[PDB]
Design a protein around this motif. Structure first.
Motif, short mmCIF file in Angstrom:
data_model
loop_
_atom_site.label_atom_id
_atom_site.label_comp_id
_atom_site.label_asym_id
_atom_site.label_seq_id
_atom_site.Cartn_x
_atom_site.Cartn_y
_atom_site.Cartn_z
N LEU C 220 -8.83 -28.23 -0.46
CA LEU C 220 -9.38 -27.88 0.86
C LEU C 220 -9.62 -29.13 1.69
N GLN C 221 -10.11 -30.17 1.05
CA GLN C 221 -10.33 -31.43 1.73
C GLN C 221 -9.08 -31.94 2.42
N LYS C 222 -7.89 -31.68 1.86
CA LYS C 222 -6.63 -32.18 2.36
C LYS C 222 -5.75 -31.18 3.12
N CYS C 223 -6.15 -29.91 3.29
CA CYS C 223 -5.17 -28.93 3.76
C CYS C 223 -5.04 -28.91 5.27
N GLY C 224 -5.88 -29.61 5.99
CA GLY C 224 -5.75 -29.76 7.44
C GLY C 224 -6.93 -29.16 8.20
N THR C 225 -6.76 -29.09 9.51
CA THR C 225 -7.81 -28.70 10.44
C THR C 225 -7.29 -27.59 11.32
N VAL C 226 -8.16 -26.66 11.68
CA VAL C 226 -7.67 -25.56 12.51
C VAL C 226 -7.16 -26.07 13.86
N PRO C 227 -6.15 -25.42 14.42
CA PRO C 227 -5.53 -25.88 15.67
C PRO C 227 -6.30 -25.35 16.86
N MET C 228 -5.99 -25.90 18.04
CA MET C 228 -6.40 -25.24 19.28
C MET C 228 -5.51 -24.00 19.47
N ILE C 229 -6.09 -22.83 19.32
CA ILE C 229 -5.34 -21.57 19.30
C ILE C 229 -4.95 -21.13 20.71
N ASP C 230 -3.76 -20.57 20.84
CA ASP C 230 -3.28 -20.00 22.10
C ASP C 230 -3.95 -18.62 22.27
N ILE C 231 -5.15 -18.63 22.83
CA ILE C 231 -5.97 -17.42 22.92
C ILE C 231 -5.27 -16.33 23.76
N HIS C 232 -4.61 -16.72 24.84
CA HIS C 232 -3.95 -15.73 25.69
C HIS C 232 -2.73 -15.09 25.03
N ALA C 233 -2.16 -15.73 23.99
CA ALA C 233 -1.09 -15.08 23.24
C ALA C 233 -1.63 -13.86 22.49
N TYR C 234 -2.90 -13.91 22.09
CA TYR C 234 -3.53 -12.70 21.54
C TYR C 234 -4.01 -11.78 22.64
N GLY C 235 -4.64 -12.32 23.69
CA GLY C 235 -5.20 -11.48 24.74
C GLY C 235 -4.18 -10.64 25.50
N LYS C 236 -2.91 -11.05 25.52
CA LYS C 236 -1.92 -10.28 26.23
C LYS C 236 -1.70 -8.88 25.63
N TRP C 237 -2.05 -8.68 24.39
CA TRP C 237 -1.90 -7.35 23.75
C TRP C 237 -2.97 -6.36 24.20
N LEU C 238 -3.94 -6.79 25.01
CA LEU C 238 -4.98 -5.88 25.46
C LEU C 238 -4.39 -4.71 26.24
N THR C 239 -3.41 -4.98 27.10
CA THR C 239 -2.76 -3.95 27.90
C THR C 239 -1.25 -3.97 27.72
#
Lengths: 240, 240, 240, 240, 240, 240
Positions: C220-239
């Motif tokens: 876990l110490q070496k597996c990396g860091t979460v990215p800055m997520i493309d939030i609007h790529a998820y939000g586009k599925w709202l409609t």
């Protein structure tokens, strides 16, 4: 494979109790920790396994005559009705009328630790407990009988391995304030006052702490109900 | 009536700190309690008032060379990144790399209790702390610098009332493992290592514990960041 | 008696892990319960023993292309930065960018259960993970590298007892989506991808699940860091 | 029947948000309650749905120059690093450097309530925020840039139903302290400052509050990082 | 606008119940989730809305004759007095004497699901419940009468839409162990045993689940009090 | 030094009560806060210091005739048996049958605030409380007598400093719905209806709020038991 068996449910309970008590063993046997915190394991066990009407804590016990017990390793008490529990100097102090049971926690069952436990419970039973008459729709009930406070000793290792030898150390006048009504040595046995025999009984048992828990549940069921406390007998100490 | 004033917000904070510390006073002054639990008040104060990245506990500190500190009254440490905190015999044992600050709790500020505090912090700074190189997208960073662990003493009553007299007891080699970097005597003063003067400073203050808290917040801000810990240096002790 | 020993602290940790896993054993072996809830024990173990930056849950994983993983017995993920965790039909669904590790829980280590675990982790690694460029005071950093998601298998009983035989079942292309990087059979051994050897390694161990925990902490110490997520790529599925 | 669909997960989220906001509607429309507690629903929504690095509360904001904002219905802020949050007269007062966003809560979107929201956010942006240089292993970083505090308005019912009409009320100088960067009218639309267009945009939307949440998540992602706060600039107010 | 109306308070309660049950609907209708977790919504609803003397859980029921019920979707029981609740293989197992009500959870009300519910409640009523005589200050009370355990069925959609048709499926011998005393189909109706009519009654209702809750509250009020349990009848299973 | 003294335990309790009430003082005296949240301090005090069978909240009280009280600053009530507590528009609404006591919170004790308190308690006592007959093993008990709801006023500063002058403002017909049975002015005195004298009594006291707490504990002990509530009298309002 395994179908439903009450014996397996009880073995599972016993395994959990035994695992928690390894912390007690490690504390008492450590050259630096030297038993620090040991009673906390038993406090936690009772808060886990007793009915929710009961609370357990390390505490002192006080009465309305300004008398105090010794420090008690485990007190089982009421909070549902109790008018106060004092939080003072990082200690808890419980009115005597709210107490159901008191226990001493030690590593070993032997003569000295039995004597120690008797001194602790005697310091609680010596306290004065109030009990007011109880008004009701048709008259006034006599004051509730005082709880028969359960005194006990909770240990891991029995150093009086002959039951009749241990019996001889446990025998005590049932009416005396130093009576012990229940206890266990987790590795070997538990003991209790048998109301039929009218005498202490020692039971060798391979799951002693869980047999003890069931005996404790039965004794709690019968030890009585908290009284209507004389609140102003405590409140008068507010001013000189 | 009262409009918004930062001085009033800070007086309110100070009043809450002072009220919590009355429990410390009552514990140390009681003929039975004799200081039991006193450090718990300070632990609770720090968990209330420090940023959420910090945790406070009474604890021992361990290193990957199987060396242990003395029992520390208050340790400020990390849990966000730290690979383990041991829960053993009802004690907490924290890896040295996760520690930011260590404090000794006493009733009074005097020569003996300064000496006691130095022995406690020295037992933590003597431990070996690991720090691995840190891979990143463009190469490998040198191992993170070790935290400058803050050592302190937390007391209620000053028995070295002349600042220059107290100064003479606090002066110490900044590089030595027994250095105290911060402390307070709640009734009179707080003290700290002043990086500009390069010397200890004693400040008489009528709200000393809150002035101390702000000095502690500033020192924590500057004391460093936890390292990438050599987890296998601890894991190798699992087997012989 | 016992002085401070890191080996004793680690034996104590191991005893607690082993006691918790008896519930997993009893669940899998019961003729009615038939493994129900088994993964919950491992989820609870990880939430107890991993650094607080990690969260563990049974969950599904989703991506911004409307693709979903299989049900994962244990997911280790981020909640500190993650923009959402869906709570739907009493299930949890986690965005793929927030995932650090995924595990399959089984009673036994054998060929079929290795295959099962590979199918589960492959269903997570097949998902599309976004990563935005990161603005900063002096320019714009390239998108953060994606986490090397840890895939694993958590079992109690090894049915491939020869290490070289188990090795032959575990060997896998490190670049393939079905790679398992870590695992254990609590009664016998743990295993991991060794970056030096560039190959899977099986370690027979008498405290295997705790050795596994330390290997997991290191991975876990070496597996990396979460990215800055493309939030609007998820939000586009709202409609639609 | 229903297979996995991100649109269904988002409809489920939206249904939960909409159900929580019925309490806001009922509060504002009640002849006795008259909006009491309405902001608490939004506070709870943000603490549920925002990443755990964010905290939301009704609060005042203070600075180290002894200046205070108006009462803010919803403040999104940091507690992980923040040196203090004052608890005074049953109110919360947050240092300005720890603030990410501030919102006004009203029943309706109209000219008066836009004006009200601008006055609230302006009272926060008018405060002085400190930022110290940041020492590091290789030198000293310039002080962190101040957070671009997000100002917003949270309403249920749009009374400016023509988007171009609402646009004309929302248009504002991006550099001015009264800028609103985001908002919603739950029954009809949400709005935001569009950095590409360099202008406010109104989006009619049938799931407006959830579209708003995703826009807020994206704005939070970009609004900056809390600075190293000048703690002694606050601590100096302890004494005169 | 809106002044205080009990009908509005009850509509608000109903709206909250209806919103929680959308999760049940989505679970049963999902092609992967397939009803997993559905009963948890009802468990949570009962723990929210029933008096605090009641606890709800998914559980098995056991008796002191080593007989076990089927798995029960929702059990309403006592923890205040109850001597134990077993936690085994991630399941809960409750002594029969502590049980007030048992429910089956299904998507639809139809013949098969009525039959299913009867089999579940019958498996609980078939168990042997102990009840000891109760000592008191003036003598010994006869053993407490056993609780009339409430059996029910909780569904969303009615597939027997004619009340008289549904009546014909619900009619049952009140003395038989398979009697259902209460239930609901959230979209259409609730039903109960009417003690005046001495027969089942179906009530079409536009707020059926809330009407059901009030009927359940009334039935709980009348179903009796937990007995003094024969603790040693359970404890004897500890050893062979 | 200090040995065990009940007077010291009670002084410690009083010091904690006094410290909590400084927040009430600061709220009422602040030119912006203007008493906001003041009652919350008293609510928290009662939830801390009353027996666990009691709950305290700011709330409205409702009856089964669709009549509502004024907003009550502090209501002491039952949740153990009570069939519902409504959560509506961020307010709590409690059935009248579950209420033990109601209090008005003000800064000062004077004629206007006594009058205010009487209007509040009268609005609760005016409500209709149901009480059903109680079936039991040997017959049917008459409906439980209704609780004698305790009405009170909780203030910090006495503006009627002559006891006989304050007495003249407090004297009231014991049978009237506006009777106040207890109260305090924390800086000076507490007051209560004395059943022996059959008249109000004012007691000057240097620890008035703690003397008040003990008087309240005694009055709660005697005020009665919640009735068996006519649940269907409330449930009938679900539909028209």
């Amino acid at each position: 494979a395994q179908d439903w068996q009450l014996s397996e449910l009880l073995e599972n309970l016993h395994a959990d109790v035994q695992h928690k008590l390894t912390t007690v063993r490690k504390s008492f046997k450590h050259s630096v920790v030297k038993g620090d915190g040991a009673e906390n394991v038993w406090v936690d066990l009772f808060n886990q396994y007793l009915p929710e009407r009961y609370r357990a804590s390390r505490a002192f016990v006080v009465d309305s005559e300004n008398q105090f017990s010794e420090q008690i390793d485990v007190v089982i008490y009421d909070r549902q009705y109790s008018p106060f529990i004092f939080h003072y100097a990082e200690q808890l102090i419980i009115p005597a009328e709210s107490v159901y049971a008191v226990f001493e926690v030690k590593q070993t069952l032997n003569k000295q630790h039995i004597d120690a436990a008797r001194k602790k419970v005697a310091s609680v039973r010596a306290l004065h407990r109030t009990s007011l008459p109880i008004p009701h729709a048709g008259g006034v009930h006599s004051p509730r009988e005082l709880i028969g406070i359960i005194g006990g000793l909770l240990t891991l290792e029995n150093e009086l391995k002959i039951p009749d030898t241990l019996m001889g150390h446990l025998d005590h006048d049932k009416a005396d304030k130093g009576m012990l009504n229940i206890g266990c040595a987790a590795d070997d046995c538990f003991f209790y006052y048998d109301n039929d025999h009218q005498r202490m009984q020692v039971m060798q048992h391979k799951k002693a702490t869980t047999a003890f828990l069931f005996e404790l549940l039965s004794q709690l069921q019968k030890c009585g109900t908290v009284p209507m406390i004389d609140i102003h007998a405590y409140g008068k100490w507010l001013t000189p």
